[PDB]
């Protein structure tokens, strides 16, 4: 409060243009390049994206990522929208929304949520430990499809409540707005939903002292991880700390709730598992024959 | 409602030619929303009130009123002397009368019922224009010649009469609704009368002579108010269907109907089905989506009497009724004989100028065995067969919540009181199971129940008295469910002194080891099993001649003792007392005694008669002497 | 309309004579002689039945169904349908053999009546 | 996408069910238009079913158009049939029910004052919403397979699928105002506003062409009569019992129950319904309503009556011919006792009354 959100807005006209380039370039072998034409016929989502790729090249907006993690989820909007229209146009046309998340190292900021200190506003937190409680899948409107039975025009409305993908501070309580001051209504024949899923990740209380509380925040999940997400498991999420603004009064005070939106889900002990190697073929076999007696005692 | 009448004739011209003669322009004026016009629906019952003639009409019940001169015209004089102005007009005779007048006070009964209220005031100035009462004469009519439900309410019926009869469980305070508005200026004195029709508050703000604003104050002290007495309804129990739960509809009562519906009865409720949109807030003007529907309330044959009484000569009668009750076992009689008197009871006799008013005629039968070898079959079909039976479980309820106990209600400020099972079923049968593993408190509350007949509980600072009064059955089981000759009976019983004393006779359910008993009862049940119903409706009556059977003695034939008839209870209740033997010298109660006159009532209230001869003494001697050999 | 099909246990797991028969089982008996057959299932030291017990666990490593003896398994819609068809029938007891019916009552009743123990 | 005109698409599919006579499933030209559409004009008939199936078989172009957009590819169907109601007029008989009577002395006022040269207002005309006395059913097409709706995606709502749920909790059946008629008590006019949605809109003003001279703000009065109820009733509904996967977690549904199937359907049986899914404009209620608050919900057109195992209220199914001489092949039973517990031995008597336990 209160400068800091509209430096944020200049920044907006130049992060649409940042990764229009990175994902349509050569430099990074040809990842990008090979598995857009795979993932187009299998009908996915989310596309696989590394963060250490873009540290090795110029090693300049690396630490941009970290200091306003907001700002970088409006560009995969619109560097995954120009790239599946431009290879195969014959199916990017009833989904005009795509999210992308992230996979690897973010930094040093991947520890427990305590330090909350004034040097952290606007950043990105994470919140670790044990899943215990877990809600349900609920179809989340993210670009609902509004048309109206008169003029006959389209209207592409977006929330704003910093909860949402491309958000500001203003209200959601389902608002009468309209650019032409025209009656919508929701038309789901080819309408974008998203798997809404919030559980909760409450730290072990092996490492609490005396003078310490632990900390619980909702963490959402995403769509291509239906039921990867079960209570009694640990995973390693990264999310962004925010605030819902609130028209309670006139002037507004000290109230803001708490809030994470997840980037991207990762699960240790489900989704991941240790592979074998070379270590598994070779002793495995030779423990079984030169033996004492019998393997069993 | 006050509706405007629009003329329907051609807008834009007069008249189109049609000199002289009226040829579609006469009288086509009616009010806008119903087929009904005050200048055509007051001709039609000013020739009712005058041109009715009713021959059918009785005398004992229609005392003062001739039959052969019209009826109403002899009414004129009886209006302005009970004091009301109120007039009672019976929606039978209006469809004897005009076809088309019946079929347009029901399909709307909000013009047609205030258009008969002016057409009667024209009549009554014609005969006595000095006799004045307090408002005008009213039309309240009732008895319609439908007879609906909840469910069966047809959305095309709104706003129509219909009427539905029901049992009221509970009725509401005094909540009072000011109908005229009454203000007072602060400079002068002016009174002006706002009507407030249609839920409207409006105030005027310009006086009579002073001509200020903000300068009349309210006052609502002296205008005219209107208790609304919300009194709830549902089904009545001898039309509701068996596997759900009846609907409760609210009824609402004004004006001089406040308090006249005693809670506990079987009145006939005449009311208009309306529908008002619920008010979320009373101050900004909010319409629910959910309406309320609300009621505001307005107000045997000789072909089978007859059949009743060639039955009661007969000797055999006492027989055939006795063993409808069976259809199953064949024999085991003894102990669904005395059942059949349990439904009559006796004609209850007052006592006040004595010190002895209440006093109960019914009879309680006591019953003992297994529950489900031969009781399985008596205890669920005394209560789909006889209207006023309440079944209820011992286990499943608690013990004050059986009866009427007290229950916090916040909504109305008052400790109000709640109704049961058995204190609803008053002058009928009860049905409850399960006596011998019963609760401990709950045996405790029978003490007073069917011995004083009236439920005293003051506790919480809550001072009420119940009079309701049932005869209630019970069915006991030994502590092993098998008679042991080696202990006596009373040993057996785990009910103690004071509660089995409290009952009539007394059965149990014995199963002999004879080999020839299984001979008269096993080939039985199975020649009935592979017959289906082609032999039920042939050698046993019907169930319809038994609901009607004790329809009619309840309220005609009033028997009483003799002076002969009645000497044979004294030398009985010697004999009975010296038993010994069994427990001993017991018995030296008025209770065997006052239960042995209640058997010789039951007797000859079966025959047809209120002479009690001597023949019916010895029968009553006779059950109470198979209760003995049976327990013994 | 409710099929019961209780599955009850003694108070000592297997059939151990230790008392009477209505009080081997925690029942009342007002549930006892209400059903129709009443069923036990023990265990004796025999080795013939044991060693059947020992062969068709065998085969359940190899086949998923019955062992490769002389019956043959089913599939799920067969005794059910073909029992279905028969609910609306309304079997009929001619006069000559109900009265079989009631001379086998009469003497169902001897073994109750000399064994008090047992059910009644 | 889907931004598709009105003003053209009610006089194509006028032409589909009127001049066209509609085939039968089994090829059979039947006379519908000629004996039921006859006697729905005599207050003898109150619902028509029509089947779905016939126009898939023969204009797949009408089928398909209501995967993109059912808002009026849905409801036309009605409009059509009501515009041949006043061409199926033979005899003239006296009006028996009690609720049309009150309406034809208020619509032959209106002739008399829509003389050519003063007009009233649009709105004071029934339409063809209350001038209809039939209430159509639409069975289940071929745009979507009758799946249930753990397997059916999200996405593929809102065209015209099948859902097999399952009954669970009803409510009371309650008279919807369909049109809410109104009343100006400042200068003696009415007011006619037909209305769908759930909620109630309270209407003040009235648009009139005498209220305007007044220049004060009209009194309308809701009246209850000269207007149309229908049966509505509320029930929520869970998805069916034998048509989960592995581990799956409810989900409610809101089904609308009007026409003659209300008051027959009772909690705990098994019902397919079929039919479009809409949202609702929540516009009248000033005291819940906050903003918008546009819920969606799924609106039912035919409920078909199944159980467990068919289609059809049975405990449960049959097969063919066939497949009856291969369990009748035996002299009384003895395959069927050892299927019980194939995995254990032993007791065969016990296996024996367990097959003896349903038949009763």
Known sequence: MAGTVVLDDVELREAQRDYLDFLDDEEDQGIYQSKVRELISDNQYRLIVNVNDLRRKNEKRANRLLNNAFEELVAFQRALKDFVASIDATYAKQYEEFYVGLEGSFGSKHVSP??????????????????????????????????????????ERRYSDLTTLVAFPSSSVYPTKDEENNPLETEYGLSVYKDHQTITIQEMPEKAPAGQLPRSVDVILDDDLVDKAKPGDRVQVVGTYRCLPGKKGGYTSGTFRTVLIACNVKQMSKDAQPSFSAEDIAKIKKFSKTRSKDIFD | QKGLQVDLQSDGAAAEDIVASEQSLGQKLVIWGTDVNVAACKENFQRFLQRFIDPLAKEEENVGIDITEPLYMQRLGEINVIGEPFLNVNCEHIKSFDKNLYRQLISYPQEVIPTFDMAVNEIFFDRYPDSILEHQIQVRPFNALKTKNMRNLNPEDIDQLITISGMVIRTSQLIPEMQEAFFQCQVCAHTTRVEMDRGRIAEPSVCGRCHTTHSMALIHNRSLFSDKQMIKLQESPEDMPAGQTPHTVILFAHNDLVDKVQPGDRVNVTGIYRAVPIRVNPRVSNVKSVYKTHIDVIHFSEKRVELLKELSRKPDIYERLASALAPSIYEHEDIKKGILLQLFGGTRKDFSHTGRGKFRAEINILLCGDPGTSKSQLLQYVYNLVPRGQYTS?????????????????????????????????????????????????????????????????????????????????????????????????????????????????????????????????????????????????????????????????????????????????????????????????????????????????????????KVEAIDVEEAKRLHREALKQSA | RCSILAAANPAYGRYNPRRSLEQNIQLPAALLSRFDLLWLIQDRPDRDNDLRLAQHITYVHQHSRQPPSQFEPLDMKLMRRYIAMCREKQPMVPESLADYITAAYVEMRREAWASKDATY | MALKDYALEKEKVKKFLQEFYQDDELGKKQFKYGNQLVRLAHREQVALYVDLDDVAEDDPELVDSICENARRYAKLFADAVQELLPQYKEREVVNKDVLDVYIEHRLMMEQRSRDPGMVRSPQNQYPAELMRRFELYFQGPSSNKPRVIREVRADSVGKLVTVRGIVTRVSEVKPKMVVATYTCDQCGAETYQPIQSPTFMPLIMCPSQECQTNRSGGRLYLQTRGSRFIKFQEMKMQEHSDQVPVGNIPRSITVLVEGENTRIAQPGDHVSVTGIFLPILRTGFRQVVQGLLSETY??????????????????????????????????????????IAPEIYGHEDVKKALLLLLVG
């Not at chain 2, 600072?461 to 019970?474: D, E």
């Not at chain 2, 009910?495 to 080891?513: A, C, E, V, Y």
């Not at chain 2, 080999?515 to 319809?544: G, I, N, P, T």
Request: proline letters at 3%; hydrophobic letters at 40%.
């Open chain 1, 114 to 155: 305590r330090t909350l200190t004034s040097c952290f506003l606007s950043c990105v937190v994470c919140v670790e430990g044990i899943v215990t409680k877990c809600s349900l899948v609920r179809p989340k409107v993210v670009r609902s499809v509004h048309y109206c039975p008169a003029t006959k025009k389209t209207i």
């Open chain 4, 298 to 339: 799924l609106e039912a057109h035919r409920i078909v009556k199944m159980n467990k195992s068919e289609d059809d209220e049975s405990g449960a199914g049959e097969l063919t011919r066939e497949e009856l001489r291969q369990i009748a092949e035996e002299d009384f039973y003895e395959k069927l006792a050892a299927s």
């Open chain 2, 394 to 610: 011992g286990k499943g309820s608690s013990a004050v919540g059986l009866t009427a106990y007290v229950m916090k209600d916040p909504e109305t400020r008052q400790l109000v009181l709640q109704t049961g099972a058995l204190v609803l079923s008053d002058n009928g049968i009860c049905c409850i199971d399960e006596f011998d593993k019963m609760n401990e408190s709950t045996r405790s509350v029978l003490h007073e129940v069917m011995e004083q007949q009236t439920l005293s509980i003051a506790k919480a600072g809550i001072i009420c008295q119940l009079n309701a009064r049932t005869s209630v059955l019970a069915a006991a089981n030994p502590i092993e469910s098998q008679w042991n000759p080696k202990k006596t009976t009373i040993e057996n019983i785990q009910l103690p002194h004071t509660l089995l004393s409290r009952f009539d006779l007394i059965f149990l359910l014995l199963d002999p080891q004879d080999e020839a008993y299984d001979r008269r009862l096993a080939h039985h049940l199975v020649a009935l099993y592979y017959q289906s119903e082609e032999q039920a409706e042939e050698e046993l009556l019907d169930m319809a001649v038994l609901k009607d059977y004790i329809a009619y003695a309840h309220s005609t034939i009033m028997p009483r003792l003799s002076e002969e008839a009645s000497q044979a209870l004294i030398e009985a209740y010697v004999d009975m007392r010296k038993i010994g033997s069994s427990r001993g010298m017991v018995s030296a109660y008025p209770r065997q005694l006052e239960s042995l006159i209640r058997l010789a009532e039951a007797h000859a209230k079966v025959r047809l008669s209120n």
